[PDB]
């Protein structure tokens, strides 16, 4: 989608805010927000691509100035409601409850060794998105390609700043989960992945740095051959 979150090339966002040093977690709620990722993932709330699509659908004004982990909370709620795993009304009631009683306890619950097992496995083993497909790569290093001007209303990794732009294939990485299907609940439908180089002049015209290039990853459907 043509969301505001697709900020590459946007002007006027202001100077960078960078403290000399900062903690990994600035508040206890952030630790919770962070841990809910593997939790909801394991529970089937969503996959990684869908997770991103939920954040992309946020109120732009809220997204631009809210704490990063709040974005995570919004996507959890988004998918909880989508999958019917979260009752919005109950959530609203509990939110008010904890507003008035911030130190009230959390629900009694039993600890689960399998959840710790999941965490360690995911952290150290990872969640590889690489996949094997039957079709060979359509493009190769050195090919000159043009990025699609399609504008899907659903999830996709098509930054507006590279659309319709011409670049050169730098490397073929093999096939991976395809965002355009995965992020929209349509499955992994793996596609070959390539890193493509675009000069700054191609991307920004005369205002671009005369000696700079941007490397952007493109799934096969995103690009079409110009020159082999």
């Amino acid at each position: 989608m043509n969301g505001v979150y697709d900020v590459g090339g946007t002007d006027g966002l202001g100077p960078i805010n960078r403290p000399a040093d900062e903690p990994v977690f600035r508040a206890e709620w952030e630790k919770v927000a962070f841990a809910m990722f593997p939790a909801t993932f394991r529970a089937g709330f969503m996959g990684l691509d869908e997770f991103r699509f939920g954040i992309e659908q946020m109120n732009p004004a809220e997204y631009l100035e809210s704490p990063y982990y709040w974005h995570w909370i919004r996507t959890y709620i988004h998918h909880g409601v989508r999958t019917g795993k979260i009752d919005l009304e109950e959530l609203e009631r509990r939110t008010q409850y904890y507003r008035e009683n911030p130190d009230a306890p959390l629900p009694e619950h039993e600890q689960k060794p399998e959840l710790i097992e999941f965490v360690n496995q995911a952290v150290y083993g990872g969640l590889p998105a690489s996949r094997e497909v039957d079709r060979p790569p359509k493009f190769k290093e050195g090919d000159v390609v043009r990025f699609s001007t399609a504008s899907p209303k659903g999830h996709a990794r098509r930054a507006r700043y590279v659309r319709g732009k011409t670049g050169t294939v730098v490397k073929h990485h093999g096939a991976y989960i395809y965002p355009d299907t995965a992020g929209n609940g349509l499955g992994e439908c793996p596609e070959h992945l390539y890193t493509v180089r675009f000069t700054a002049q191609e991307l920004w015209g005369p205002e671009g740095d005369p000696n700079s290039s941007v490397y952007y990853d493109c799934w096969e459907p995103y690009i079409e051959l110009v020159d082999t």
């Binding site: 946007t10 939790a39 394991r42 529970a43 959890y76 909880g80 795993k85 507003r99 629900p107 700079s212």
Partner: protein
């Protein structure tokens, strides 16, 4: 930036805290979230996974020409040689800074970073300001924000990680470090140097 419509940070934090505790209570009752799970994820990234891991890779590459070749050939496999890898770092491609080229990494579409070698990213890396500007005016941004001046003649390659492939910068080894031990060299490697917004520490 100022926004006359925005509540105070204190009020924002109070509201979020309540909303998160409420959501947490529900996930807990569903049996998919527990306090030990929360504490474990937090301890891993507060004390176990950090940029010190990336530094180990960098110093080995600086002192082992062959490892360096393997690193640039296949980042994920090379790092596994040191027991380094995992969540959000399943696919890594390292790019080397030279006298002719400087690399800088960004995730304009969100905030992706190779956690296994850099740990969770600082907030500025995930925010709109850096993400929007770095692909458009990398040279000025590096100078203005990080006091890092990259000569006009030196090419700046900006890597926008739009896929699961994670790009990591192998900074040039600072001069005056001949024969230094891996431990001594590591003191010069920073998270910033592996993102490309700063070179490794001088001297």
């Amino acid at each position: 930036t100022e926004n006359i419509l925005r509540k105070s940070d204190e009020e924002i934090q109070k509201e979020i805290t309540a909303r998160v505790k409420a959501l947490e209570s529900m996930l807990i009752e569903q049996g998919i979230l527990t306090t030990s799970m929360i504490d474990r994820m937090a301890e891993i990234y507060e004390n176990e996974v950090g940029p010190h891991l990336g530094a180990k890779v960098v110093v080995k590459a600086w002192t082992d020409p062959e490892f360096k070749k393997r690193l640039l050939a296949d980042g994920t496999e090379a790092c596994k040689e040191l027991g380094i890898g995992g969540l959000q770092g399943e696919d890594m491609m390292w790019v080397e800074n030279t006298d002719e080229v400087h690399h800088v990494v960004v995730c304009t579409l969100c905030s992706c970073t190779p956690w296994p070698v850099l740990g969770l990213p600082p907030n500025w890396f995930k925010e709109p300001q850096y993400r929007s500007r770095v692909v458009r005016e990398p040279r000025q941004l590096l100078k203005e924000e990080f006091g890092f001046e990259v000569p006009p003649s030196k090419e700046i390659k900006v890597w926008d990680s739009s896929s699961e492939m994670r790009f990591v910068v192998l900074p040039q080894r600072p001069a005056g470090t001949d024969g230094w031990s891996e431990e001594e060299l590591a003191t010069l490697v920073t998270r910033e140097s592996m993102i490309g917004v700063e070179p490794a520490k001088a001297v």
